[PDB]
Design a protein around this ligand. Structure first.
Ligand SMILES: *[C@@H]1O[C@H](CO)[C@@H](O[C@@H]2O[C@H](CO)[C@@H](O)[C@H](O)[C@H]2NC(C)=O)[C@H](O)[C@H]1NC(C)=O
Ligand SMILES: *[C@@H]1O[C@H](CO)[C@@H](O)[C@H](O)[C@H]1NC(C)=O
Lengths: 49, 49, 46
């Protein structure tokens, strides 16, 4: 699995929409990774409805 | 790429100069249903519509 | 209460996950202060 860490000190982090932004599409993306991330809204809705 | 020369050095800097460009109707930001939005990597543009 | 402000100017904001990321386990850092952040999903299921 992949992480997002600063460029001066190794701080591996769970890649999330918290600290990531989207500006493209898979077609436009080269060697796109079919890699998923965590969205902190889906499971919560189903649990408490 | 460095290149040696008699009593000197000759470089071969490889650059990347943008080619022809088009005019666009940019905008500072964007907002839908009362929620201001800002660009994350690039700058907004307009095809015309 | 705890506020997250920019560097030079003083503009407090409600500490939200949108303007803060996560890391580590909180068991190794020093100076951590217990506090609550806002979950936007709560009003959508009331
Ligand atoms: C990531 O997902 C894309 C989604 O299309 C995959 O692209 C297709 O993968 C199937 C797998 O059998 C191929 O048959 C298709 O030809 C691919 N392209 C299209 C347009 O359908 C891609 O293969 C996936 N990546 C990995 C590593 O599995
Ligand atoms: C913060 O919460 C944790 C959770 O158990 C608790 O152990 C800790 O004592 C709390 N901090 C303070 C200063 O009480």
């Amino acid at each position: 699995h992949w992480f997002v860490t600063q460029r001066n000190f190794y701080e591996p982090q769970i890649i999330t929409t918290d600290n990531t932004f989207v500006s493209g599409n898979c077609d436009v993306v080269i060697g796109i990774v079919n890699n998923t991330v965590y969205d902190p809204l889906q499971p919560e809705l189903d649990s408490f409805k | 790429f460095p290149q040696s020369a008699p009593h000197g050095v000759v470089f071969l800097h490889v650059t990347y100069v943008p080619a022809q460009e088009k005019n666009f109707t940019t905008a500072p930001a964007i907002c839908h249903d009362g929620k201001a939005h800002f660009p994350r990597e690039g700058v907004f543009v307009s095809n015309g519509t």
